[PDB]
Amino acid sequence: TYVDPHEDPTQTVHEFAKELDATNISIDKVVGAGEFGEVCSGRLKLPSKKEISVAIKTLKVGYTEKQRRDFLGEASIMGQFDHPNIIRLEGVVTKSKPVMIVTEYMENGSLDSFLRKHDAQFTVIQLVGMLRGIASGMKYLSDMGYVHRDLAARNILINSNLVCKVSDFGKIPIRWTSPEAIAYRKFTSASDVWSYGIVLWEVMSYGERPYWEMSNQDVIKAVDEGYRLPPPMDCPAALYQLMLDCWQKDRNNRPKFEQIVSILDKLIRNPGSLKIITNLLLDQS
Ligand SMILES: Nc1ncnc2c1ncn2[C@@H]1O[C@H](COP(=O)(O)OP(=O)(O)NP(=O)(O)O)[C@@H](O)[C@H]1O
Ligand SMILES: [Mg+2]
C-alpha cells in the first residue's frame, strides 16, 4: 500500500528515501530543465563501491519552502515503489545545498520525443514490449493504491535497452484524462486505464499528439459524444481494440491493468496475432 505524504516535522522523504553522501555523486552534463531547477546526468558510487549512471535533479538556489516541499514530495512518492517499470529513486541529498534527487539514468529520455525521432522504425513486437513494461509498472502502482493522474508518453522514460518506466510523480492534462475525471474529478485506477489507452495510441503513432491541436472544449465534447482517436497507421486490430476497451465510457467496463498486461503478453507469445491490421471516429455503443 501507498501512503500519501499528507504533518511531519520536516521530512517524510527519509521514510522512503536514502540520504546520499554527496562525495559519492559526480555531475556530467545538463540534460533537461524542471519546475524546480536543472536535471543533469552523472554517476553514483554505491556503498558496495559499484558505480552507476544516474539522473540528478537539483533544487534552484533561493527556493521557497513550498518549492522544497513539492520537490522532495515527488521523492517521497517515488521511493515507495520498487519495480522494474517504475523509475528507481537512488536517494536524496538534503543535508547540503543544493538539495538533490537522484534517480536511475534513462539514456533515451522521454518516450514521446524518442519515438518522434524514429517514426516507423521499430517492429510491432518492439512497440508491444514498451507497452507491456508501462502496463506492468501501472499494475504495481494501482496495486499500491496510487492513482497517477498524469500518465502520458511524455511522463514515461526509456533506457538504452528500450525498457520503459513510469515517471512524474507530482489540474488538468485534458487529452489524457478520462471523461468522468474531467466531468467531476472522479480519479480512480480506471481513469489511469483510460490514460493508458491514450499512451497506447501515442506509442503506436510514434509520438503524435493525442487529439492534435483540437480546442480543449472540443476534445471534451467529442469524447463525451462517443468519438475516439482513429487507428494509427498500420495498427494491429488487437491493439486498436485494446485502446477502445481502455476508452469505454463506463469505467467499470475498462480492463484492469493486470488484464492489460495479460493481453499484451499473449500478443508477445503469438506475434502472428499482430499481423491482422485495422478525424475522430464515432464508436457510441
Ligand atoms: N532518469 C532520467 N534519465 C535521463 N534523463 C532524464 C531522467 N529524468 C529526466 N530526464 C531528462 O530531463 C528532461 C526533463 O525532466 P522531467 O522529468 O520531464 O521534468 P519535468 O519537470 O517534467 N520538465 P519537462 O518534461 O521538460 O516539462 C526529460 O525530458 C529527460 O530528457
Ligand atoms: Mg516531464
PDB file of C-alpha atoms and ligand atoms in Angstrom:
ATOM      1  CA  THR A   1       0.000   0.000   0.000  1.00  0.00           C
ATOM      2  CA  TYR A   2       0.990   3.537  -0.933  1.00  0.00           C
ATOM      3  CA  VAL A   3       0.790   6.201   1.795  1.00  0.00           C
ATOM      4  CA  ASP A   4       0.024   9.800   0.800  1.00  0.00           C
ATOM      5  CA  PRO A   5       2.789  12.058   2.200  1.00  0.00           C
ATOM      6  CA  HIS A   6      -0.021  14.167   3.719  1.00  0.00           C
ATOM      7  CA  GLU A   7       2.221  16.690   9.093  1.00  0.00           C
ATOM      8  CA  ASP A   8       5.788  15.541   9.592  1.00  0.00           C
ATOM      9  CA  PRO A   9       8.376  17.734  11.326  1.00  0.00           C
ATOM     10  CA  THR A  10      10.219  18.218   8.025  1.00  0.00           C
ATOM     11  CA  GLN A  11      10.964  15.038   6.044  1.00  0.00           C
ATOM     12  CA  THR A  12       8.528  12.283   5.156  1.00  0.00           C
ATOM     13  CA  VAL A  13      11.143  11.724   2.434  1.00  0.00           C
ATOM     14  CA  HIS A  14      13.630   9.993   4.752  1.00  0.00           C
ATOM     15  CA  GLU A  15      10.997   7.330   5.481  1.00  0.00           C
ATOM     16  CA  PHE A  16      11.171   6.329   1.786  1.00  0.00           C
ATOM     17  CA  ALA A  17      14.445   7.906   0.564  1.00  0.00           C
ATOM     18  CA  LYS A  18      18.089   7.185   1.369  1.00  0.00           C
ATOM     19  CA  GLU A  19      20.234  10.190   2.305  1.00  0.00           C
ATOM     20  CA  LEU A  20      23.200  10.053  -0.061  1.00  0.00           C
ATOM     21  CA  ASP A  21      26.678  11.347   0.692  1.00  0.00           C
ATOM     22  CA  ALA A  22      27.380  13.992  -1.985  1.00  0.00           C
ATOM     23  CA  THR A  23      31.013  12.797  -2.189  1.00  0.00           C
ATOM     24  CA  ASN A  24      29.549   9.772  -3.987  1.00  0.00           C
ATOM     25  CA  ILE A  25      27.858  11.917  -6.679  1.00  0.00           C
ATOM     26  CA  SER A  26      29.586  13.304  -9.774  1.00  0.00           C
ATOM     27  CA  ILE A  27      27.853  15.529 -12.330  1.00  0.00           C
ATOM     28  CA  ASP A  28      28.469  15.090 -16.060  1.00  0.00           C
ATOM     29  CA  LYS A  29      26.148  17.360 -18.087  1.00  0.00           C
ATOM     30  CA  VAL A  30      22.816  19.182 -18.066  1.00  0.00           C
ATOM     31  CA  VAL A  31      20.141  17.087 -19.816  1.00  0.00           C
ATOM     32  CA  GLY A  32      16.916  18.964 -19.049  1.00  0.00           C
ATOM     33  CA  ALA A  33      15.105  21.637 -17.083  1.00  0.00           C
ATOM     34  CA  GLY A  34      12.391  21.118 -14.500  1.00  0.00           C
ATOM     35  CA  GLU A  35       9.892  23.105 -12.489  1.00  0.00           C
ATOM     36  CA  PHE A  36      12.352  23.331  -9.565  1.00  0.00           C
ATOM     37  CA  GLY A  37      15.800  23.533 -11.214  1.00  0.00           C
ATOM     38  CA  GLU A  38      18.116  21.693 -13.611  1.00  0.00           C
ATOM     39  CA  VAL A  39      18.295  18.000 -14.499  1.00  0.00           C
ATOM     40  CA  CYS A  40      21.762  16.538 -15.125  1.00  0.00           C
ATOM     41  CA  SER A  41      23.295  13.167 -15.800  1.00  0.00           C
ATOM     42  CA  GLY A  42      26.110  11.794 -13.692  1.00  0.00           C
ATOM     43  CA  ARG A  43      27.454   8.887 -11.669  1.00  0.00           C
ATOM     44  CA  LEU A  44      26.733   7.493  -8.213  1.00  0.00           C
ATOM     45  CA  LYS A  45      29.145   5.376  -6.188  1.00  0.00           C
ATOM     46  CA  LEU A  46      27.139   2.854  -4.168  1.00  0.00           C
ATOM     47  CA  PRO A  47      28.143   1.597  -0.673  1.00  0.00           C
ATOM     48  CA  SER A  48      29.455  -1.599  -2.326  1.00  0.00           C
ATOM     49  CA  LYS A  49      31.754   0.649  -4.452  1.00  0.00           C
ATOM     50  CA  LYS A  50      29.852  -0.161  -7.661  1.00  0.00           C
ATOM     51  CA  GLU A  51      29.427   2.924  -9.837  1.00  0.00           C
ATOM     52  CA  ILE A  52      26.204   3.518 -11.785  1.00  0.00           C
ATOM     53  CA  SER A  53      24.816   6.173 -14.122  1.00  0.00           C
ATOM     54  CA  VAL A  54      22.151   8.410 -12.624  1.00  0.00           C
ATOM     55  CA  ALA A  55      19.983  11.434 -13.338  1.00  0.00           C
ATOM     56  CA  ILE A  56      20.315  14.242 -10.837  1.00  0.00           C
ATOM     57  CA  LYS A  57      17.703  16.910 -10.196  1.00  0.00           C
ATOM     58  CA  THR A  58      18.697  19.973  -8.186  1.00  0.00           C
ATOM     59  CA  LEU A  59      16.513  22.453  -6.294  1.00  0.00           C
ATOM     60  CA  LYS A  60      17.222  26.001  -7.527  1.00  0.00           C
ATOM     61  CA  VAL A  61      19.085  28.456  -5.309  1.00  0.00           C
ATOM     62  CA  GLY A  62      16.716  30.741  -3.373  1.00  0.00           C
ATOM     63  CA  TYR A  63      13.895  28.197  -3.370  1.00  0.00           C
ATOM     64  CA  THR A  64      10.688  28.811  -1.424  1.00  0.00           C
ATOM     65  CA  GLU A  65       9.794  26.360   1.353  1.00  0.00           C
ATOM     66  CA  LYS A  66       6.743  25.340  -0.721  1.00  0.00           C
ATOM     67  CA  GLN A  67       9.081  24.583  -3.656  1.00  0.00           C
ATOM     68  CA  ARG A  68      11.241  22.417  -1.369  1.00  0.00           C
ATOM     69  CA  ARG A  69       8.182  20.523  -0.100  1.00  0.00           C
ATOM     70  CA  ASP A  70       6.801  19.930  -3.615  1.00  0.00           C
ATOM     71  CA  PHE A  71      10.265  18.963  -4.887  1.00  0.00           C
ATOM     72  CA  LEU A  72      11.033  16.437  -2.143  1.00  0.00           C
ATOM     73  CA  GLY A  73       7.390  15.298  -2.138  1.00  0.00           C
ATOM     74  CA  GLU A  74       7.980  13.650  -5.529  1.00  0.00           C
ATOM     75  CA  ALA A  75      10.842  11.683  -3.984  1.00  0.00           C
ATOM     76  CA  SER A  76       8.651  10.619  -1.046  1.00  0.00           C
ATOM     77  CA  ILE A  77       6.168   9.092  -3.508  1.00  0.00           C
ATOM     78  CA  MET A  78       8.720   7.578  -5.914  1.00  0.00           C
ATOM     79  CA  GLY A  79      10.657   5.925  -3.066  1.00  0.00           C
ATOM     80  CA  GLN A  80       7.580   3.912  -2.090  1.00  0.00           C
ATOM     81  CA  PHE A  81       7.839   1.939  -5.335  1.00  0.00           C
ATOM     82  CA  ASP A  82      10.427  -0.697  -6.185  1.00  0.00           C
ATOM     83  CA  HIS A  83       9.563  -2.163  -9.576  1.00  0.00           C
ATOM     84  CA  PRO A  84      11.491  -2.648 -12.838  1.00  0.00           C
ATOM     85  CA  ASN A  85       8.998  -0.455 -14.737  1.00  0.00           C
ATOM     86  CA  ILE A  86       8.852   2.424 -12.253  1.00  0.00           C
ATOM     87  CA  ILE A  87      11.753   4.881 -12.158  1.00  0.00           C
ATOM     88  CA  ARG A  88      14.096   3.954  -9.314  1.00  0.00           C
ATOM     89  CA  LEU A  89      14.934   6.513  -6.632  1.00  0.00           C
ATOM     90  CA  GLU A  90      18.606   6.089  -5.693  1.00  0.00           C
ATOM     91  CA  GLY A  91      18.294   8.687  -2.939  1.00  0.00           C
ATOM     92  CA  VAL A  92      18.256  12.329  -1.976  1.00  0.00           C
ATOM     93  CA  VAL A  93      20.690  14.949  -0.708  1.00  0.00           C
ATOM     94  CA  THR A  94      19.096  17.260   1.880  1.00  0.00           C
ATOM     95  CA  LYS A  95      21.842  17.902   4.468  1.00  0.00           C
ATOM     96  CA  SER A  96      23.738  20.063   1.978  1.00  0.00           C
ATOM     97  CA  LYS A  97      22.557  22.539  -0.635  1.00  0.00           C
ATOM     98  CA  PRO A  98      21.678  22.405  -3.458  1.00  0.00           C
ATOM     99  CA  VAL A  99      19.148  19.752  -2.428  1.00  0.00           C
ATOM    100  CA  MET A 100      19.124  16.799  -4.868  1.00  0.00           C
ATOM    101  CA  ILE A 101      17.015  13.897  -6.039  1.00  0.00           C
ATOM    102  CA  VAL A 102      18.994  11.076  -7.683  1.00  0.00           C
ATOM    103  CA  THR A 103      17.270   8.528  -9.953  1.00  0.00           C
ATOM    104  CA  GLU A 104      18.315   5.752 -12.334  1.00  0.00           C
ATOM    105  CA  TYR A 105      19.617   7.063 -15.666  1.00  0.00           C
ATOM    106  CA  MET A 106      17.439   6.513 -18.746  1.00  0.00           C
ATOM    107  CA  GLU A 107      19.630   7.052 -21.790  1.00  0.00           C
ATOM    108  CA  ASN A 108      16.848   7.515 -24.356  1.00  0.00           C
ATOM    109  CA  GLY A 109      14.905  10.107 -22.361  1.00  0.00           C
ATOM    110  CA  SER A 110      11.170  10.789 -22.566  1.00  0.00           C
ATOM    111  CA  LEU A 111       9.259   8.261 -24.643  1.00  0.00           C
ATOM    112  CA  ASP A 112       7.211  10.649 -26.780  1.00  0.00           C
ATOM    113  CA  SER A 113      10.254  12.618 -28.019  1.00  0.00           C
ATOM    114  CA  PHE A 114      12.228   9.388 -28.540  1.00  0.00           C
ATOM    115  CA  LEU A 115       9.507   7.866 -30.753  1.00  0.00           C
ATOM    116  CA  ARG A 116       9.145  11.096 -32.780  1.00  0.00           C
ATOM    117  CA  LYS A 117      12.801  10.745 -33.765  1.00  0.00           C
ATOM    118  CA  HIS A 118      12.179   7.184 -35.021  1.00  0.00           C
ATOM    119  CA  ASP A 119       8.889   7.342 -36.906  1.00  0.00           C
ATOM    120  CA  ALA A 120       8.034   3.898 -38.353  1.00  0.00           C
ATOM    121  CA  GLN A 121      11.476   2.476 -37.395  1.00  0.00           C
ATOM    122  CA  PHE A 122      10.579  -0.128 -34.741  1.00  0.00           C
ATOM    123  CA  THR A 123       8.946  -3.523 -35.128  1.00  0.00           C
ATOM    124  CA  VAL A 124       5.444  -4.049 -33.742  1.00  0.00           C
ATOM    125  CA  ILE A 125       6.918  -6.502 -31.187  1.00  0.00           C
ATOM    126  CA  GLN A 126       9.371  -3.811 -30.019  1.00  0.00           C
ATOM    127  CA  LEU A 127       6.486  -1.366 -29.507  1.00  0.00           C
ATOM    128  CA  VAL A 128       4.425  -4.025 -27.677  1.00  0.00           C
ATOM    129  CA  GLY A 129       7.408  -4.679 -25.394  1.00  0.00           C
ATOM    130  CA  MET A 130       7.474  -0.977 -24.486  1.00  0.00           C
ATOM    131  CA  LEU A 131       3.718  -1.003 -23.843  1.00  0.00           C
ATOM    132  CA  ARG A 132       3.919  -4.154 -21.722  1.00  0.00           C
ATOM    133  CA  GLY A 133       6.531  -2.548 -19.471  1.00  0.00           C
ATOM    134  CA  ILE A 134       4.391   0.554 -18.980  1.00  0.00           C
ATOM    135  CA  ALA A 135       1.343  -1.627 -18.168  1.00  0.00           C
ATOM    136  CA  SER A 136       3.379  -3.658 -15.681  1.00  0.00           C
ATOM    137  CA  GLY A 137       4.532  -0.526 -13.851  1.00  0.00           C
ATOM    138  CA  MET A 138       0.935   0.741 -13.756  1.00  0.00           C
ATOM    139  CA  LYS A 139      -0.270  -2.626 -12.432  1.00  0.00           C
ATOM    140  CA  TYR A 140       2.089  -2.221  -9.464  1.00  0.00           C
ATOM    141  CA  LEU A 141       1.113   1.424  -8.893  1.00  0.00           C
ATOM    142  CA  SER A 142      -2.592   0.511  -8.907  1.00  0.00           C
ATOM    143  CA  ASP A 143      -1.839  -2.467  -6.602  1.00  0.00           C
ATOM    144  CA  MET A 144      -0.321   0.036  -4.163  1.00  0.00           C
ATOM    145  CA  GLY A 145      -3.455   2.230  -4.315  1.00  0.00           C
ATOM    146  CA  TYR A 146      -1.738   5.016  -6.114  1.00  0.00           C
ATOM    147  CA  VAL A 147      -3.619   6.905  -8.893  1.00  0.00           C
ATOM    148  CA  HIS A 148      -1.070   8.599 -11.157  1.00  0.00           C
ATOM    149  CA  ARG A 149      -3.388  11.138 -12.884  1.00  0.00           C
ATOM    150  CA  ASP A 150      -0.721  12.221 -15.390  1.00  0.00           C
ATOM    151  CA  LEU A 151       0.002   9.011 -17.329  1.00  0.00           C
ATOM    152  CA  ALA A 152       1.232  10.189 -20.747  1.00  0.00           C
ATOM    153  CA  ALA A 153       4.090   9.201 -23.069  1.00  0.00           C
ATOM    154  CA  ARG A 154       5.991  12.372 -22.015  1.00  0.00           C
ATOM    155  CA  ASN A 155       5.992  11.018 -18.445  1.00  0.00           C
ATOM    156  CA  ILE A 156       7.481   7.649 -19.407  1.00  0.00           C
ATOM    157  CA  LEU A 157      11.289   7.360 -19.680  1.00  0.00           C
ATOM    158  CA  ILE A 158      13.077   4.807 -21.841  1.00  0.00           C
ATOM    159  CA  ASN A 159      16.538   3.309 -21.292  1.00  0.00           C
ATOM    160  CA  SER A 160      19.312   2.093 -23.559  1.00  0.00           C
ATOM    161  CA  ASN A 161      17.598  -1.334 -23.891  1.00  0.00           C
ATOM    162  CA  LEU A 162      14.189   0.246 -24.706  1.00  0.00           C
ATOM    163  CA  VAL A 163      12.788  -0.582 -21.271  1.00  0.00           C
ATOM    164  CA  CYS A 164      10.033   1.907 -20.401  1.00  0.00           C
ATOM    165  CA  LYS A 165       9.368   3.125 -16.880  1.00  0.00           C
ATOM    166  CA  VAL A 166       6.708   5.291 -15.312  1.00  0.00           C
ATOM    167  CA  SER A 167       7.956   8.691 -14.065  1.00  0.00           C
ATOM    168  CA  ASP A 168       6.483  12.045 -12.997  1.00  0.00           C
ATOM    169  CA  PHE A 169       5.075  11.533  -9.502  1.00  0.00           C
ATOM    170  CA  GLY A 170       3.980  15.085  -8.793  1.00  0.00           C
ATOM    171  CA  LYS A 171      -5.359  20.153 -12.959  1.00  0.00           C
ATOM    172  CA  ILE A 172      -5.522  19.063 -15.815  1.00  0.00           C
ATOM    173  CA  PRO A 173      -3.930  17.145 -18.714  1.00  0.00           C
ATOM    174  CA  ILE A 174      -7.245  17.170 -20.622  1.00  0.00           C
ATOM    175  CA  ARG A 175      -6.127  14.987 -23.547  1.00  0.00           C
ATOM    176  CA  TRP A 176      -5.053  12.157 -21.244  1.00  0.00           C
ATOM    177  CA  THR A 177      -7.865  12.357 -18.693  1.00  0.00           C
ATOM    178  CA  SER A 178     -10.969  10.163 -18.551  1.00  0.00           C
ATOM    179  CA  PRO A 179     -14.336  11.823 -19.206  1.00  0.00           C
ATOM    180  CA  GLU A 180     -15.522  11.235 -15.588  1.00  0.00           C
ATOM    181  CA  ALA A 181     -12.295  12.713 -14.212  1.00  0.00           C
ATOM    182  CA  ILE A 182     -12.807  15.801 -16.414  1.00  0.00           C
ATOM    183  CA  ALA A 183     -16.528  15.997 -15.558  1.00  0.00           C
ATOM    184  CA  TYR A 184     -16.271  15.826 -11.760  1.00  0.00           C
ATOM    185  CA  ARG A 185     -12.719  14.872 -10.735  1.00  0.00           C
ATOM    186  CA  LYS A 186     -13.542  11.172 -10.404  1.00  0.00           C
ATOM    187  CA  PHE A 187      -9.954   9.824 -10.396  1.00  0.00           C
ATOM    188  CA  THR A 188      -9.567   6.058  -9.923  1.00  0.00           C
ATOM    189  CA  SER A 189      -7.275   3.326 -11.305  1.00  0.00           C
ATOM    190  CA  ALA A 190      -9.866   3.040 -14.131  1.00  0.00           C
ATOM    191  CA  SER A 191      -9.137   6.671 -15.079  1.00  0.00           C
ATOM    192  CA  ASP A 192      -5.429   5.706 -15.259  1.00  0.00           C
ATOM    193  CA  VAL A 193      -6.517   2.838 -17.577  1.00  0.00           C
ATOM    194  CA  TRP A 194      -8.140   5.459 -19.826  1.00  0.00           C
ATOM    195  CA  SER A 195      -4.835   7.382 -19.840  1.00  0.00           C
ATOM    196  CA  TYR A 196      -3.033   4.136 -20.660  1.00  0.00           C
ATOM    197  CA  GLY A 197      -5.248   3.769 -23.747  1.00  0.00           C
ATOM    198  CA  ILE A 198      -4.078   7.224 -24.834  1.00  0.00           C
ATOM    199  CA  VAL A 199      -0.423   6.225 -24.232  1.00  0.00           C
ATOM    200  CA  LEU A 200      -1.064   3.100 -26.342  1.00  0.00           C
ATOM    201  CA  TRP A 201      -2.269   5.387 -29.151  1.00  0.00           C
ATOM    202  CA  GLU A 202       0.748   7.680 -28.667  1.00  0.00           C
ATOM    203  CA  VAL A 203       3.204   4.788 -28.938  1.00  0.00           C
ATOM    204  CA  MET A 204       1.573   3.212 -31.998  1.00  0.00           C
ATOM    205  CA  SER A 205       1.513   6.705 -33.578  1.00  0.00           C
ATOM    206  CA  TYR A 206       5.195   7.308 -32.821  1.00  0.00           C
ATOM    207  CA  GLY A 207       4.507  10.261 -30.535  1.00  0.00           C
ATOM    208  CA  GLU A 208       1.751  12.106 -32.387  1.00  0.00           C
ATOM    209  CA  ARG A 209      -0.116  14.417 -30.000  1.00  0.00           C
ATOM    210  CA  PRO A 210      -3.456  12.974 -28.823  1.00  0.00           C
ATOM    211  CA  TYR A 211      -6.315  14.923 -30.481  1.00  0.00           C
ATOM    212  CA  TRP A 212      -3.647  17.002 -32.237  1.00  0.00           C
ATOM    213  CA  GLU A 213      -4.345  20.713 -31.503  1.00  0.00           C
ATOM    214  CA  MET A 214      -8.134  20.442 -31.186  1.00  0.00           C
ATOM    215  CA  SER A 215      -9.722  23.024 -28.914  1.00  0.00           C
ATOM    216  CA  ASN A 216      -9.856  21.568 -25.351  1.00  0.00           C
ATOM    217  CA  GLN A 217     -13.616  22.192 -25.255  1.00  0.00           C
ATOM    218  CA  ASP A 218     -13.918  20.087 -28.416  1.00  0.00           C
ATOM    219  CA  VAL A 219     -11.766  17.258 -27.017  1.00  0.00           C
ATOM    220  CA  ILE A 220     -14.106  17.154 -24.005  1.00  0.00           C
ATOM    221  CA  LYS A 221     -17.313  17.327 -26.063  1.00  0.00           C
ATOM    222  CA  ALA A 222     -16.204  14.960 -28.840  1.00  0.00           C
ATOM    223  CA  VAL A 223     -15.100  12.252 -26.407  1.00  0.00           C
ATOM    224  CA  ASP A 224     -18.327  12.668 -24.441  1.00  0.00           C
ATOM    225  CA  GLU A 225     -20.345  12.196 -27.663  1.00  0.00           C
ATOM    226  CA  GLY A 226     -18.570   8.833 -28.215  1.00  0.00           C
ATOM    227  CA  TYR A 227     -15.845   9.939 -30.633  1.00  0.00           C
ATOM    228  CA  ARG A 228     -12.424   8.340 -30.245  1.00  0.00           C
ATOM    229  CA  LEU A 229      -8.954   8.710 -31.689  1.00  0.00           C
ATOM    230  CA  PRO A 230      -8.669   6.816 -35.006  1.00  0.00           C
ATOM    231  CA  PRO A 231      -6.458   3.792 -35.541  1.00  0.00           C
ATOM    232  CA  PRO A 232      -2.814   4.733 -36.069  1.00  0.00           C
ATOM    233  CA  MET A 233      -1.352   3.800 -39.447  1.00  0.00           C
ATOM    234  CA  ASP A 234      -0.709   0.061 -39.800  1.00  0.00           C
ATOM    235  CA  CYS A 235      -2.028  -0.514 -36.247  1.00  0.00           C
ATOM    236  CA  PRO A 236      -2.782  -4.142 -35.385  1.00  0.00           C
ATOM    237  CA  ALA A 237      -6.514  -4.746 -34.829  1.00  0.00           C
ATOM    238  CA  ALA A 238      -5.767  -6.282 -31.421  1.00  0.00           C
ATOM    239  CA  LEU A 239      -4.129  -3.052 -30.251  1.00  0.00           C
ATOM    240  CA  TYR A 240      -6.807  -0.717 -31.591  1.00  0.00           C
ATOM    241  CA  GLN A 241      -9.410  -2.885 -29.852  1.00  0.00           C
ATOM    242  CA  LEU A 242      -7.372  -2.612 -26.643  1.00  0.00           C
ATOM    243  CA  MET A 243      -7.442   1.206 -26.998  1.00  0.00           C
ATOM    244  CA  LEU A 244     -11.215   1.138 -27.486  1.00  0.00           C
ATOM    245  CA  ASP A 245     -11.572  -1.084 -24.422  1.00  0.00           C
ATOM    246  CA  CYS A 246      -9.459   1.344 -22.321  1.00  0.00           C
ATOM    247  CA  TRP A 247     -11.722   4.140 -23.606  1.00  0.00           C
ATOM    248  CA  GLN A 248     -15.063   2.627 -22.577  1.00  0.00           C
ATOM    249  CA  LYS A 249     -17.483   5.304 -21.390  1.00  0.00           C
ATOM    250  CA  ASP A 250     -18.384   3.201 -18.358  1.00  0.00           C
ATOM    251  CA  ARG A 251     -15.245   2.977 -16.200  1.00  0.00           C
ATOM    252  CA  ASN A 252     -16.407  -0.356 -14.760  1.00  0.00           C
ATOM    253  CA  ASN A 253     -16.163  -1.892 -18.269  1.00  0.00           C
ATOM    254  CA  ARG A 254     -12.496  -0.959 -18.781  1.00  0.00           C
ATOM    255  CA  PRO A 255      -9.893  -3.709 -18.309  1.00  0.00           C
ATOM    256  CA  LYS A 256      -7.784  -3.756 -15.121  1.00  0.00           C
ATOM    257  CA  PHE A 257      -4.044  -3.260 -15.521  1.00  0.00           C
ATOM    258  CA  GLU A 258      -3.465  -6.967 -14.748  1.00  0.00           C
ATOM    259  CA  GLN A 259      -5.735  -7.782 -17.713  1.00  0.00           C
ATOM    260  CA  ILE A 260      -3.848  -5.379 -19.982  1.00  0.00           C
ATOM    261  CA  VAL A 261      -0.533  -6.997 -19.069  1.00  0.00           C
ATOM    262  CA  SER A 262      -2.043 -10.415 -19.824  1.00  0.00           C
ATOM    263  CA  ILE A 263      -3.410  -9.232 -23.192  1.00  0.00           C
ATOM    264  CA  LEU A 264      -0.019  -7.867 -24.243  1.00  0.00           C
ATOM    265  CA  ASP A 265       1.796 -10.989 -23.022  1.00  0.00           C
ATOM    266  CA  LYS A 266      -0.468 -13.087 -25.276  1.00  0.00           C
ATOM    267  CA  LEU A 267       0.395 -10.880 -28.265  1.00  0.00           C
ATOM    268  CA  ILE A 268       4.102 -11.236 -27.437  1.00  0.00           C
ATOM    269  CA  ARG A 269       3.709 -15.048 -27.293  1.00  0.00           C
ATOM    270  CA  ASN A 270       1.672 -15.214 -30.505  1.00  0.00           C
ATOM    271  CA  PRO A 271       3.220 -12.443 -32.664  1.00  0.00           C
ATOM    272  CA  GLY A 272       1.279 -13.679 -35.709  1.00  0.00           C
ATOM    273  CA  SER A 273      -1.766 -12.151 -33.987  1.00  0.00           C
ATOM    274  CA  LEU A 274      -0.312  -8.693 -34.693  1.00  0.00           C
ATOM    275  CA  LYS A 275      -0.499  -9.283 -38.464  1.00  0.00           C
ATOM    276  CA  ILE A 276      -4.269  -8.642 -38.508  1.00  0.00           C
ATOM    277  CA  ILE A 277      -4.322  -4.886 -39.277  1.00  0.00           C
ATOM    278  CA  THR A 278      -7.220  -2.481 -38.596  1.00  0.00           C
ATOM    279  CA  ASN A 279     -10.519  12.797 -37.907  1.00  0.00           C
ATOM    280  CA  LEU A 280     -12.123  11.189 -34.831  1.00  0.00           C
ATOM    281  CA  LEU A 281     -14.182   8.006 -35.240  1.00  0.00           C
ATOM    282  CA  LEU A 282     -17.574   7.597 -33.591  1.00  0.00           C
ATOM    283  CA  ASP A 283     -18.000   4.400 -31.600  1.00  0.00           C
ATOM    284  CA  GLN A 284     -21.018   5.148 -29.436  1.00  0.00           C
ATOM    285  CA  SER A 285     -22.289   1.766 -28.157  1.00  0.00           C
TER     286      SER A 285
HETATM  287  N1  LIG B   1      16.146   9.481 -15.098  1.00  0.00           N
HETATM  288  C1  LIG B   1      16.451  10.211 -16.197  1.00  0.00           C
HETATM  289  N2  LIG B   1      17.381   9.816 -17.100  1.00  0.00           N
HETATM  290  C2  LIG B   1      17.698  10.539 -18.189  1.00  0.00           C
HETATM  291  N3  LIG B   1      17.102  11.715 -18.476  1.00  0.00           N
HETATM  292  C3  LIG B   1      16.163  12.220 -17.650  1.00  0.00           C
HETATM  293  C4  LIG B   1      15.777  11.492 -16.434  1.00  0.00           C
HETATM  294  N4  LIG B   1      14.838  12.213 -15.804  1.00  0.00           N
HETATM  295  C5  LIG B   1      14.640  13.328 -16.565  1.00  0.00           C
HETATM  296  N5  LIG B   1      15.433  13.327 -17.657  1.00  0.00           N
HETATM  297  C6  LIG B   1      15.536  14.335 -18.753  1.00  0.00           C
HETATM  298  O1  LIG B   1      15.143  15.623 -18.293  1.00  0.00           O
HETATM  299  C7  LIG B   1      14.012  16.087 -19.041  1.00  0.00           C
HETATM  300  C8  LIG B   1      13.077  16.833 -18.113  1.00  0.00           C
HETATM  301  O2  LIG B   1      12.820  16.022 -16.969  1.00  0.00           O
HETATM  302  P1  LIG B   1      11.323  15.689 -16.475  1.00  0.00           P
HETATM  303  O3  LIG B   1      11.390  14.527 -15.514  1.00  0.00           O
HETATM  304  O4  LIG B   1      10.456  15.559 -17.699  1.00  0.00           O
HETATM  305  O5  LIG B   1      10.958  17.012 -15.629  1.00  0.00           O
HETATM  306  P2  LIG B   1       9.720  17.997 -15.942  1.00  0.00           P
HETATM  307  O6  LIG B   1       9.609  18.859 -14.712  1.00  0.00           O
HETATM  308  O7  LIG B   1       8.511  17.164 -16.307  1.00  0.00           O
HETATM  309  N6  LIG B   1      10.136  19.061 -17.261  1.00  0.00           N
HETATM  310  P3  LIG B   1       9.555  18.824 -18.895  1.00  0.00           P
HETATM  311  O8  LIG B   1       9.256  17.348 -19.031  1.00  0.00           O
HETATM  312  O9  LIG B   1      10.673  19.292 -19.783  1.00  0.00           O
HETATM  313  O10 LIG B   1       8.336  19.713 -18.998  1.00  0.00           O
HETATM  314  C9  LIG B   1      13.384  14.840 -19.655  1.00  0.00           C
HETATM  315  O11 LIG B   1      12.665  15.105 -20.864  1.00  0.00           O
HETATM  316  C10 LIG B   1      14.583  13.955 -19.880  1.00  0.00           C
HETATM  317  O12 LIG B   1      15.173  14.231 -21.157  1.00  0.00           O
HETATM  318 MG    MG B   2       8.175  15.658 -17.666  1.00  0.00          MG
END
